[PDB]
């Protein structure tokens with residue numbers, strides 16, 4: 658599923674991301690835009706053979722099991738396939754674990770490079786939250 662901007666904002670708010678670990682909703686929407694262009698079925702293979710999955714491009718190196726990342730971990734206790742659903746629930750629950758791991762939203766390189774320190778409120782402008 659390819660979400661619209663305000664539609665993912667509404668879904669992320671409905672699923673408890675607004676201000677999670679102190680990150681306003683606009684941070685999460687910005688991160689999803691630049692990780693996946695709001696596409697829940699986004700996948701990208703990393704150089705090391707791990708893969709990033711879903712709207713927040715969660716990595717099989719640490720977070721989910723895909724059976725093809727020798728010696729990775731599965732810290733969200735989910736098949737990576739759970740992170741490609743049209744329902745953003747598994748991606749949100751795993752994103753809540755990641756953002757708690759010590760580095761906050763810096764875990765998402767596109768967030769650090771494209772969203773961090775910007776006017777992230779712009780991402781929820783004109784949306785009924």
Ligand SMILES: [Cl-]
Pocket residue numbers: 678760761762
């Ligand atoms: Cl933080």
Ligand code: NA
Pocket residue numbers: 717718719720721722723726729730731
């Ligand atoms: Na893994």
